[PDB]
Structure formats: structure tokens, C-alpha cells
RNA sequence: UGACUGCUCCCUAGCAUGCUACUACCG
RNA sequence: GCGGUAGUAGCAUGCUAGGGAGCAG
């Protein structure tokens with residue numbers, strides 16, 4: 001309140017009225033002793049009820065503008081994370097076996113369900129039981145999707161390496177059974 | 188209440204306006220005094236309501252604090268507590284099978300698998316000492332989990348097939364006593 | 375987080391923020407430790423900080439607790455009470471507080487380098503638990519200063535017994551390898567087993583304690599754990615036991631020692647004992663004696 | 667009036683998700699929102715159903731005596747029971763099934 | 770009564786067994802989940818006290834993990 | 848790891864209205 | 875004697891936001 005431009009009048013009117021109490025004041029000067037700090041006090045309160053509103057308004061943009069900054073800084077951290085993805089899932093397209101089906105296409109459009117089926121290098125087979133295993137993945141090589149795949153690893157549900165000799169007809173009760181066979185393309 | 192700095196105004200003015208009717212005076216003096224009582228009374232019924240709100244407010248922040256500190260000691264001690272809960276609850280059930288496999292597995296006779304409920308139901312426990320064997324099983328009969336099993340094979344530490352006739356507080360000090368007894372359920 | 379102010383034996387929940395171990399101080403230690411010593415930071419179940427976008431006034435100085443959080447002066451949502459007022463700091467246990475008459479404990483030990491003679495001599499006239507805390511603060515200051523040192527590395531593999539090592543440039547480097555350097559290695563981005571190496575001689579001659587396989591770029595730096603709080607005194611009051619009851623003495627007695635039965639009976643009727651023994655003063659063969 | 671299955675309201679106070687209701691004093695609002703659902707069981711002709719509501723009003727009071735008695739023996743704090751007694755009285759919940767909506 | 774005290778001790782028995790990382794063997798966690806889901810659906814206190822022996826024996830066959838002696842001399846069954 | 852909707856209880860901050868006393872100028 | 879005007883404190887209502895929790899499909 002030490003810089004409000006209505007402190008001078010209030011201060012002076014207080015001094016004139018209050019400080020001059022000991023001195024004999026007649027009933028005519030008493031009006032000046034009374035109706036001089038009055039009105040001035042009203043105006044000061046008016047000069048303080050507007051300052052309090054300007055302060056709050058001000059401290060509602062120095063908070064709503066930190067939030068406009070925060071979000072743009074964030075908008076630049078996700079815009080650079082999707083970019084770092086769509087350029088890492090691209091360096092992975094064996095562009096000899098992929099430009100060989102987009103080319104044999106009538107216009108260059110192909111179904112998406114035949115891209116991993118004809119242009120992939122690895123196969124993952126998930127097998128529930130032993131009966132399913134001998135009709136799908138018997139031996140070290142097997143044919144699927146008009147191709148030939150050679151087994152490379154057989155992990156299990158626990159993710160521990162199984163060998164192709166632990167898989168018997170009677171040792172089967174001793175394996176975590178969802179078995180995951182990883183195979184590579186041949187030729 | 189008391190002890191508030193603004194309290195020596197609702198005491199002097201309260202005492203004055205008070206005594207003022209016995210001695211008495213003009214209506215002017217009475218009005219003057221009342222317009223000092225109310226002028227320095229609002230100052231009391233304002234500084235003893237703000238406090239009235241701070242005194243209860245304080246006792247809330249210092250209660251959320253008590254909750255954020257008991258709920259972090261209730262979560263950091265989960266392990267130690269649920270094991271105590273379980274054994275306080277296992278004593279109250281007063282079962283017979285449950286109170287056997289617990290006493291047996293405190294002196295040493297723990298199992299090596301799940302206790303099966305079928306009729307073949309092979310079992311494997313580890314008798315640590317001769318007294319535990321003498322109390323539990325006599326002959327070819329074994330009592331465990333309030334059920335009777337028939338011993339089908341006894342095995343010392345490595346693969347030492349003990350015959351039931353040579354384990355008798357005698358030949359007994361000469362072996363590796365953590366045995367692995369195999370049995371099958373009865374009926 | 376409800377520890378204990380053992381500067382008063384008071385049970386509290388605060389702790390000095392910018393302090394060595396961040397120990398538990400009551401409402402009467404953490405009141406005067408902050409005003410004189412500049413530790414304008416206290417840590418509670420939640421840190422005493424501003425709670426409004428961007429604020430950087432974090433000093434439990436005149437911070438006011440209102441609206442379920444600690445606001446500040448500069449921007450004023452005051453409508454509340456200050457955190458530090460009436461010879462106390464706000465927090466749990468604000469009523470059950472005792473106080474300390476030795477004000478300048480932190481004022482003397484939390485600012486110095488934990489090496490002055492005066493600190494040590496006034497420490498050796500303290501109680502058992504305050505000195506336990508002083509020893510834990512000595513271990514903690516050693517470990518804190520353990521991460522303000524240099525790091526070794528090898529970027530070029532050379533022939534055996536002739537390598538080169540640079541430590542650092544322009545910083546204040548002697549160390550009696552007392553505890554030797556076992557860092558861990560790096561090849562491209564992950565950690566690789568290296569083992570433990572010993573550097574004594576030192577182009578620069580290298581000795582070998584055990585066979586290893588140097589790789590390119592292997593770093594060496596020491597990581598040390600933090601000493602956990604303990605719950606037991608160091609010394610014990612003197613209290614002679616009732617008798618030697620509860621023991622199993624043996625019929626046979628040694629005869630090459632002429633001071634064996636007397637000391638056996640003494641330890642039988644004595645509780646705790648300390649001596650000043652040079653090497654070879656009973657540590658060699660008397661342990662077997664009391665064993666048999 | 668609609669009323670639930672008693673085994674659903676009883677079994678919702680016994681089985682939860684930690685720190686939730688493995689300590690009732692840290693959340694007494696869970697049991698005021700479960701006694702609102704159990705209120706119209708007080709009108710049931712079966713007296714084993716009408717007891718599920720009086721069991722929830724007796725536990726909310728237990729969880730309040732503890733809370734205002736656990737912050738008086740470890741921290742010298744004294745809570746005032748003014749405007750807390752409404753949650754173990756069967757008139758705060760009766761007003762949720764009567765017309766002339768409020769709030 | 771007695772069927773509600775067994776149905777609450779098998780909820781605390783598969784939480785002790787889930788905090789000991791028995792979830793990392795999916796050949797034994799698949800039996801413990803079947804002995805706990807079956808006790809909760811039981812309708813006799815003679816065929817739920819026998820799946821509580823199989824389920825409890827999983828904890829007593831896990832050696833070091835649970836200190837049985839300390840936990841039984843802790844103001845409990847002696 | 849934790850979807851889309853709807854209803855509802857409790858606590859805190861802000862805005863306007865509704866009967867009063869206090870101020871002060873004005874009638 | 876009364877009315878209007880501008881601040882200040884105090885008690886309830888509705889609405890707009892944030893936070894925690896409960897139920898239903």
C-alpha cells in the first residue's frame with residue numbers, strides 16, 4: 001500500500017485530525033477533524049479494492065502461461081518419439097522381397113495380411129500340447145505357407161530353453177506346455 | 188476466546204458502558220461510548236473467528252498427515268503381516284490334518300511336493316532324524332495329514348536304498364539321515 | 375517416515391533437508407538449526423515447497439500452510455499461518471516436544487569438514503547414541519565425499535606389462551590404494567564383467583594379480599553402499615553376574631599355563647572386560663583354551 | 667424401492683484392493699456409500715436382511731471412535747464430533763429415497 | 770462359521786504364495802489357482818479342509834522362504 | 848497392464864443472489 | 875424520524891472447476 005497514489009491524502013487527513021486532538025478543538029473545526037479523514041478513507045479503500053483485483057487477475061496469467069509452455073514442450077517430446085519409431089520400424093523391410101510383390105501387383109495395392117506371410121524372415125509357432133506338436137513342427141525342418149522353415153530355438157512358457165529331445169511322448173508331462181518354436185526361412 | 192491481543196477493548200468498553208448506567212449521564216455520552224464499544228468490538232469478533240477457523244483447519248492438515256504416514260507403514264510391512272495373519276488364522280481353525288502337517292513341518296518333516304488327494308497319490312517327505320521316523324511310521328504304515336500311506340521306497344542322501352529292517356536306533360547312526368521316503372495313499 | 379530425534383529422545387517426523395544424513399530433528403532442534411545455520415529446508419511426509427506452477431521459492435522460512443499445501447509470500451494466497459512460529463516448526467508431534475540445551479550441535483558439525491579436533495573432543499564427551507550417530511555421520515560423510523573423486527579408464531589395449539593410464543585434469547589425486555579399484559567395464563552401451571585389478575607400480579609398468587582380458591574403453595570407479603541404522607549400544611554398564619551358573623565346565627585343565635584357572639574363574643564372575651594387548655597377547659592360543 | 671443382494675453388499679466390505687479397506691479409518695467414505703445401497707433392506711420382511719444396514723451403521727461409528735481416539739493418544743489432538751453423527755443415524759440415508767431432490 | 774473361516778484363510782494363503790514369486794513357475798501357480806478357486810466354491814467343510822492341505826503344503830515345501838519356527842513362536846500355535 | 852457412459856455421497860478454492868450489524872458521504 | 879449509494883465481516887442456497895471414493899450395465 002506504500003505506492004498507492006491515494007496514500008498522501010489519507011496520511012495528511014489522519015495527521016490533521018488525529019494528531020490535533022490534544023489541542024483545543026471547537027465544534028466547528030471538529031467537522032474538519034471528522035469529515036477530512038472520512039471520504040479520503042473511502043477512496044483509499046476504493047484504491048485498495050481495485051489493486052487487490054488487479055493483483056489476482058495478474059496472478060492468473062502467470063499460471064495459465066506456464067501451462068501453455070509446459071504443453072508445447074511436451075508436444076515436442078511426443079512429436080519426436082513417434083518420428084523415432086516410424087523410422088526404426090522402417091529400417092527393417094528386406095527391400096528385395098517386398099519390392100517383388102508391390103511390383104507384381106496390378107496397381108501396387110496388396111492386402112496387408114499377406115505381407116508378413118510372404119516377406120518375413122522369422123516364424124513363431126505357439127503349441128499347446130504334444131499331439132499338436134507332431135502334426136505341425138516335427139523334426140528340425142517343416143513346411144508352412146508354401147515354404148520351408150528350419151527350427152532355431154524352442155523356449156517354453158517360463159522362457160527356458162528346451163531341446164528337441166526333451167519333447168517325448170512321455171516326458172511331455174514335465175514341460176511348461178505353451179511351447180514357442182522360432183524358425184528361420186530356408187533358401 | 189482470551190489471550191488474543193485484541194481483547195483489552197471488549198473489556199474496558201464493556202466495563203465502562205456497563206457501569207455507566209448507575210452513575211448515569213446525558214444521552215450524548217451514552218451514544219459516544221456505544222460508538223466506541225461497537226468500533227472496538229468488531230475488532231474482537233473478527234480476530235476470534237479467523238482464529239476459530241485456523242484452529243480447526245490446523246487440526247485437519249495435521250490429520251491428512253497422520254493418514255499419509257500410517258498408510259505408508261501399512262504398505263511397507265505387507266510381507267511381515269500377512270504371514271502373521273495366516274498363522275493367527277490357522278491356529279483358530281483347530282483342524283486335525285492342518286495341525287499335523289504344521290507340527291510335522293516344524294520339527295523337520297516337510298514334504299517335497301503337493302499333497303495329492305487321489306488313491307495312488309505318490310508322496311515324498313524328508314525325515315531328518317530317528318525319533319521323527321519312530322513316532323510317525325512303524326512297519327510299512329505311515330501316518331501323515333490324518334491319512335495312512337504305505338511306504339514303497341526309502342532313500343538316503345544320494346541313492347542309498349534303505350531296507351526297512353536296517354533303520355533301528357542302531358544301524359541308524361551310520362547313514363545320512365535326511366531320508367527321502369516315498370509312499371502312496373491308502374483308502 | 376516416523377523416526378526419532380535422539381538429540382532429545384523425542385519421537386518426531388521431520389528431518390533437516392540440506393544436511394549430511396538428513397536425520398530426525400524435533401520441533402525444537404529443527405527450529406534453531408534453520409535460523410542460524412542456513413539449512414533453509416526441512417523434509418516431512420511431503421517436502422516443504424511451494425505448490426504452484428513454476429514457483430522457485432522453497433524455503434520453509436515464512437511459508438504459509440493453507441488449502442492443503444504450502445504456499446509462499448511473494449505471490450500471496452496468505453489466508454493462513456506461517457510454518458515457523460512460536461519457537462517450533464509445524465509437523466506431527468507438535469505438542470510432545472522436549473527440546474535440547476546444546477543448541478550448536480549441527481551449527482558446529484553440519485558445516486565443518488568433519489575433521490576438526492574440537493568436534494572430535496566434544497564428541498568424546500557425549501552420550502552413547504549421540505556418538506553412534508556421530509560415527510554414522512562420519513561414515514556418511516566419507517561415502518558422500520566418495521562420489522566427488524576421479525575415475526580411471528582404458529581406451530587403448532596395449533601389450534601386457536606396458537600400458538598407460540590418465541586419471542584427471544585440473545582438480546585437487548593421492549590415494550594409498552588401501553581398498554582397491556573394482557569398477558565394471560563397458561563395451562558399447564551395456565555393462566561387461568571385468569573383475570578386480572590392482573595398480574601398484576607406475577611407459578607405465580603393470581603387474582598382474584590374476585589373469586584377465588582387457589577390452590577397449592573399460593572404466594573403473596567405486597560404488598559404496600550406505601551404512602544402515604543400527605539399534606544397539608557400544609559399551610555396557612558394569613554388573614557382576616550372580617555366579618558361574620548356567621555353564622558346563624570341564625574336568626580337565628591345562629598345565630602349561632600358570633594363569634588359566636584364575637582367569638577362567640574371573641571371566642566366570644565378571645561380565646565385560648577390556649585390555650590393551652599387543653600382537654601375541656592371548657589372541658594366538660587362548661581362544662582354543664576357552665574353546666576346549 | 668430397489669434393494670440389492672445382501673451377499674453383494676456384505677462381500678464388498680470383506681474383499682477389496684489393499685490400503686483400501688484393510689484399514690477402515692483411512693477410508694470411511696467407502697462405508698457411507700455402501701450403507702446408502704443397503705438402506706432399503708431395513709423394510710424387508712426377513713430380519714436377517716434388515717440387519718445388514720444396522721451392521722454398517724455400527725461399523726461407521728466404530729471407525730470414527732477409533733479415528734478420533736487414535737489422534738488423541740499419539741498426537742495430543744482433540745477432534746470435535748459435531749456434524750459427524752449424521753452418518754450413523756438412519757435419516758441421512760432415508761432422504762436418498764424420498765422425492766424433492768436435494769444437491 | 771467353519772466354512773467361512775476356511776474361505777478366508779485360502780485368500781491369505783494365495784497372497785503369501787504370490788509374494789514369494791510362485792508366479793514364476795507356471796506349472797505350480799496353475800495348481801494353486803485351481804485349489805483356491807475350488808475352495809471358494811465348496812459347499813461342505815469336509816471337502817474344503819482337504820484342498821487346504823494340498824494348498825498349504827506348497828508353502829511348507831518352499832524351504833528357506835518362510836521361517837516356520839519364528840512364525841509359530843510369535844504368540845501363535847506352539 | 849487399468850475402456851466407454853450414467854448416477855450419487857464427502858472435502859477445498861472462486862463467482863452472483865438472499866435477511867442483518869459496522870463503517871462513511873449523501874440526501 | 876426514513877430512503878439510496880460504496881466498502882467490510884458473518885450465516886445458507888444454486889452453478890461452474892479440481893481431488894479422493896461407491897455402485898450399475
Ligand SMILES: [Zn+2]
Nearest residue numbers: 390392393413
Ligand atoms: Zn541440516
Ligand SMILES: [Zn+2]
Nearest residue numbers: 379382400403
Ligand atoms: Zn529435538
Ligand SMILES: [Zn+2]
Nearest residue numbers: 424426429446
Ligand atoms: Zn507460490
